[PDB]
Each structure stands twice: as C-alpha cells, then as structure tokens.
C-alpha cells in the first residue's frame, strides 16, 4: 500500500506540501507523474509544478535524481522511504490544481507521484487541514476511511488509477444533498454565488433519475457535483462517481428567478453531460483506455461516440426529463447544426480523424479551426441525432438510441470489456431489423455534410436556413433581422474597434486580406465600433465595395472589400407537424 500525505501548506504562495511513503522500494525505484489527465486529451506536463523534491530513509537523507521531465529515481534502501515535495497550484480549471486563501481544488494527477511497479496497489490519502484555514470543508468522491463527512481525514483508493480519478474541492463550501433512485447525490459550490440550491438540486434529481432509469443501473454508489463558481468560466471533467465543474455565477439560478433562462440551461446541460459520462467513458470506454497510458499521447478515433453521443444527450435528456420544452431544445439543436455546417473544415477532416488527432488538431486548434478541422463533439452529436431518428423509423419507434446506449453499456461497459473502433457499427450491423451501415461509415470516415433535412421532416420538423443577424450570431434561433452582408469572419467589437477572431476561407474578409488578430478600425471611412458596426452594414448589399482600415500588429492596412452573397449559415429548426414527432419530442 502506498501512502500520500497532502497539506495545503501555503495559501498565499499557492503551494501544497506532499509526502509519499513507500514501505518497500525496489532497486533504484522510480517515481513518475502523469503527463496528461484522463478526459482531457492534451499533454500538459503537470510535473513542472513539482518543487523542491527530496527523499529520506531510516532518518537519513536519501539521494534522488530526476531522470526525465516527469520521472525520478531513488537511491537503494533496505528501509521504507518517504519522498517530500511541494506543488504549485495556480491554474483555475477542472484539470489541474488551484489554491489561494479562498479555496482549493486538485486532481491527484497533479499532486501524487506514482510508484513505478507498485501502481496496482491501494493508495491511501491523508488530507490535513491547512493551518491558515482550518474551518474549511472538504468534498470528494474518494472513499472515506476517517474524519467527519465533509472535513479532514483519510481516504482510500483501490489503486493509482482510482486515486487520480477523485478530484478534491476545499473551502467555504455550500453543500446540498439529494437523492435519485435511492442513491445519494451532492451539489457542492465554492466561490461567491446566490444559488437556490433546493431548486437546482430538485432539477438535478430529475435529470439524474432520467439517466439511471435509462441505463437501468448506476455504476457508482453515490455522486458529487464539485462546482467552482467564478464570474466567467466554463468547463467540466467527468469521473467515476463525481465531476469537477467550473461555471459562471450567472448560470446558477437564484431564488428570485422563477423561469428557465439560457445561462441556467447551460449549467444543467453541463451537469447532464458529465453525469452521462459516468456510463459513457468512465465505465464503457475504448480498449485503448484499458488501462490508461499517461506518459504520452494515446490515440483513438472513438471520441465521436464517447463525446458525440454525450453531446447529443446532454441537451436532449434535458427536454426528455421535462426541464426544457421542445422550443428550447430545437434552438440548441439548430445551434449545433449551424456550427457544423458553418466552416470548410468538415470537408477537410473526417470525424474519426478529428478524434484521433485530438491531441494536436483539436486541443491545440487556433483561428483556422473552422477552415481545417471538424468537431467530433458537434458532428458526433449530429451523428447521434441521425441514429436515434433512423433507428426509430426502422423499428417503428420501438428501438431508440437511448435503448442502444443502455444495451451497449451492459455489454461492454458494466463488464469493462471496452469498445474497439468498429464495435459500435458492427453491433448495429448485426442488430435484427436495422441497417445503418452505409450511413455511419460515411458519417465516420468521409468528409461531407450529413443529410438531416429528410430525417427531421419525417418527424414533423422543418429546417430553414438564413443569414445570421451578424457574423458572431450563428444560432438555431431565427430573427426578423437577417443581415444582407457579412465579413465571413468572427470578431470582438469594442469602442476601440473590431478585433478579428476567425476569418472564413473564400469569404468577404478573406478576399480583402484581413486576418485573425487584425483590428478593424474603420469601414467605408467610418469609425467601426460595437455601437456602429451593424448600422454601417445595414447599408450594403452583395456587390458593394468599401474600403477597410485595419491594424495588423501596429501597421495600418488600407484594404478594399467587396461584400459577397453571405452564407445562409443559421439553421433554424421548428416543429410544423406535431403528430409526426412520435414521442421523440413533446410539444
Ligand atoms: Zn465530454
């Protein structure tokens, strides 16, 4: 058994003190730290935050040398060895570790070195109260061995893999418990907020019960939603019996807000997304992740399923559980549809290829993303949408994609068997009464658009495309105010000008020679601002030419731009034939 002692020792310095005790080390024992954390496919080199590491054995300092960016080698010893080090935690995200005088958060991939060769043995973790903040509370899904329930104490994990899958959140925590199908759940909040926890918790109970009913079984015995609340932030990371979320304070509905709003909906969608991951990705997962190799990139083209299906259900289950109506849901659907269809990237990269290169193409994507890559999240979501609709028509509404998820989970998930790249398609190709082979293969390996118009028509859903109100409003929401022209580029407007974020290939901005990073200062010799950009553009029609003045770094460019026929990129979805819904949606 390996023992870990952690103490948030320096709040102002953002430093955790960490001790590791190895009862018996091997000859020239090695210690290593993951270079990436499960669920976030980007090499992050956490080891860089480890500071002043040293070792000791039998009352004497023990020599230890660092042999690589994330690996240490200990001198031989006949006695137990204790390794001491500090960890710098100043990254506000659900991914590494953060610590100041107001709160603390951490993933053990960042704090706990793994003992080479003894990684399958149990790991004990002793969390000591920070001397500077002893009244702080503790929240985590890691099995507790001692201490008051939301306070300091000892925890145990079956092995290193389990250890690094239990994030910790400490501070002046707000904790609201609830139950879904006899299982205990917790909503935990850290940060300034005005959340009506009873109401949010009541909605989570609904979402959660819907999911447990869906799989007809839960892979955990309790679940905790660890939430950091800031002014402007988004993000979440799934775990076997918990999730770490970073959300905006405006997303947590207050006691004085009766109706549902887009922000609170985004939060519920996020929670629904991480929760679903409990089955999809935490238990049911690709074989390449059984076990995880955390020293280097681990390639798999299956994220179209593990992220795609989840990206379809996080919103859909919100309507299915009765949190949002079909109007809100279809707006979200149109948003997704519009995003996938917006750029040329869909014709440059297949969805499986995108999953495979998540480590570079996706996680290290830049301004040219819409022109060169496709989202395995968004397109995977549309694939899921297609399968759900196709399976329903082919089985006369007896087989839903939800049902398929349940079954796939019991077969390959609950059993820890794992899925190979072709498992899901073959599983469907050998399912009595349904054939989706040609469709799925093209959806998965070709670089073209998917046909959902006909599919949605069969369920009474009408699809109409139109020009968004502006370059930054590609939604699934109509507007009596469609634009006649547009840059074919996203931008951030302010009194100082329009900061260009993305330039779409072969469109207006592109031909004029504008680039991401440039700052448009004037259009047709008129000051361009947040206030004036739309007024200025309601004066042109395709074919008109104007001069654009913009700065590239500190150089002022005088460019000529001719407004093209703008793309009808907003896919607005609406139900026109209710009786054709057949239960997919509730009017
Ligand atoms: Zn996800």
Pairwise CA distance, residues 340 & 323, whole Å: 26
Pairwise CA distance, residues 417 & 523, whole Å: 60
Q: Is position 49 annotated in a ligand binding site?
A: no
Instruction: At 162, give phi and psi (nearest 5°).
Output: -75, -40
Q: Answer for the pair 85, 53: CB distance below 8 angstroms, yes or no.
A: yes
CA–centroid distance, residue 435 to ligand 1 (Å): 28
Q: Answer for the pair 6, 125: CB distance below 8 angstroms, yes or no.
A: yes
Structure tokens at 547: 């001069």
| Candidate CATH numbers 2.60.40.3650, 3.90.1150.10, 3.90.700.10, 2.40.30.10; the one for domain 2-173 | 2.60.40.3650
| Candidate CATH numbers 1.10.1510.10, 3.20.20.70, 2.30.30.90, 2.30.42.10; the one for domain 485-587 | 2.30.42.10
CA–centroid distance, residue 466 to ligand 1 (Å): 30
Instruction: Tell which residue, 115, 160, 157, has the closest CA to residue 21.
Output: 115
CATH number of 174-448: 1.10.390.10
CA–centroid distance, residue 264 to ligand 1 (Å): 19
Pairwise CA distance, residues 73 & 125, whole Å: 22
Q: Is position 307 annotated in a ligand binding site?
A: yes
Instruction: Tell which residue, 100, 119, 207, has the closest CA to residue 163.
Output: 119
Domains 2-173 and 485-587 share a fold: no
Q: Is position 193 annotated in a ligand binding site?
A: no
First-to-final CA distance of the chain: 56
Gaps in the chain after residue (C–N beyond 2.5 Å):
none
CA–centroid distance, residue 315 to ligand 1 (Å): 13
Q: Answer for the pair 133, 190: CB distance below 8 angstroms, yes or no.
A: no
3-state SS of the chain: helix, strand, coil percent to 5? 30, 30, 45
Pairwise CA distance, residues 313 & 383, whole Å: 12
Instruction: Provide the residue count of the chain.
Output: 587
Instruction: Tell which residue, 271, 269, 227, has the closest CA to residue 249.
Output: 227
Give the single-character DSSP code of 352. Answer: H
What is the bridge-based pairing of β-strands 222-230 and 183-190? parallel
For this entry, resolution in Å reads: 2.4
CA–centroid distance, residue 208 to ligand 1 (Å): 16
Pairwise CA distance, residues 496 & 567, whole Å: 28
Domain extents in the chain:
2-173, 174-448, 485-587
Q: Answer for the pair 257, 267: CB distance below 8 angstroms, yes or no.
A: no
CA–centroid distance, residue 313 to ligand 1 (Å): 11
CA–centroid distance, residue 43 to ligand 1 (Å): 17
The residue written with tokens 């054709």 in the block is 580
The residue written with tokens 């899958």 in the block is 165
CA–centroid distance, residue 377 to ligand 1 (Å): 8
How were these coordinates obtained? X-ray
CA–centroid distance, residue 40 to ligand 1 (Å): 9
Pairwise CA distance, residues 400 & 313, whole Å: 12
């Amino acid at each position: 058994m390996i023992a870990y002692d952690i103490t948030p020792i320096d709040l102002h310095g953002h430093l955790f003190n960490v001790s590791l005790t190895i009862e018996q080390t091997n000859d020239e024992q090695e210690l290593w730290l993951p270079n990436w954390i499960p669920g976030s496919y980007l090499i992050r080199d956490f080891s860089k935050h480890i500071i002043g590491l040293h070792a000791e054995s039998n009352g004497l300092s023990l020599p230890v040398k660092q042999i690589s960016k994330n690996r240490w080698q200990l001198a031989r010893s006949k006695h137990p060895v204790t390794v001491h080090y500090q960890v710098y935690a100043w990254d506000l995200s659900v991914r590494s570790a953060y610590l100041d005088q107001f709160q603390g958060f951490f993933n053990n991939t960042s704090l706990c070195l793994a003992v080479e060769g003894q990684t399958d043995l149990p790991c004990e973790l002793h969390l000591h109260a920070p001397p500077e903040a002893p009244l702080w509370k503790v929240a985590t899904g890691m099995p507790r061995k001692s201490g008051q329930p939301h306070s300091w104490g000892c925890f145990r994990a079956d092995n290193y893999d389990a250890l690094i899958d239990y994030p910790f959140l400490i501070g002046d925590l707000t904790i609201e418990e609830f139950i879904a199908h006899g299982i205990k759940h917790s909503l935990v909040l850290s940060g300034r907020h005005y959340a009506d926890t009873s109401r949010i918790t009541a909605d989570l109970a609904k979402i959660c019960e819907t999911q447990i009913s869906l799989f007809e079984e839960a892979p955990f015995q309790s679940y905790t939603f660890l939430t950091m609340v800031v002014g402007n932030g988004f993000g979440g990371l799934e775990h076997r019996n918990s999730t770490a979320l970073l959300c905006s304070r405006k997303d947590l509905i207050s006691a004085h807000q009766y109706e549902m709003n887009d922000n609170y909906q985004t939060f519920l969608s996020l929670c629904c997304h991480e929760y679903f991951h409990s089955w999809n990705i935490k238990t049911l997962k690709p074989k390449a992740f059984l076990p995880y190799q955390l020293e280097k990139e681990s390639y798999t083209e299956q994220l179209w399923f593990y992220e795609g299906m989840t990206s379809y259900f996080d919103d859909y289950l919100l309507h299915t559980s009765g949190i949002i109506d079909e109007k809100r849901y279809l707006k979200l659907l149109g948003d997704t549809l519009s995003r996938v269809e917006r750029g040329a990237g869909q014709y440059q990269q297949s969805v499986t290829e995108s999953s495979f290169l998540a480590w570079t193409k996706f996680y290290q994507q830049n301004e040219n993303a819409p022109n060169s890559i496709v989202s395995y999240y968004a397109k995977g979501a549309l694939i899921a949408l297609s399968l759900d609709l196709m399976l329903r028509l082919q089985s006369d509404h007896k087989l839903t994609l939800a049902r398929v998820m349940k079954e796939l989970w019991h077969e390959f998930g609950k059993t820890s068997i794992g899925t190979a790249d072709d498992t899901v398609i073959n599983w469907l190709n050998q399912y009595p009464g349904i054939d989706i082979s040609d469709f799925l293969k093209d959806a998965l390996y070709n670089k073209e658009s998917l046909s959902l118009v006909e599919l949605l028509q069969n369920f009474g859903v009408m699809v109409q495309k139109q020009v968004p109100v502006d370059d930054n409003s590609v939604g699934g929401k109509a507007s009596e105010q469609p634009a006649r022209v547009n840059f074919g580029a996203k931008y951030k407007a302010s009194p100082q000008g329009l900061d260009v974020l993305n330039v779409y290939h072969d469109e207006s901005a592109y031909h004029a020679g504008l680039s991401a990073g440039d700052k448009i200062i004037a259009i047709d010799h008129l000051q361009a601002t947040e206030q004036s950009v739309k007024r200025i553009l309601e004066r042109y029609i395709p074919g008109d030419t104007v001069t654009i003045h913009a700065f590239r770094r500190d150089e002022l460019m005088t460019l000529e731009l001719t407004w093209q026929e703008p793309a009808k990129s907003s896919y607005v979805l609406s139900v026109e034939q209710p009786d054709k819904l057949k239960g997919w949606l509730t009017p």
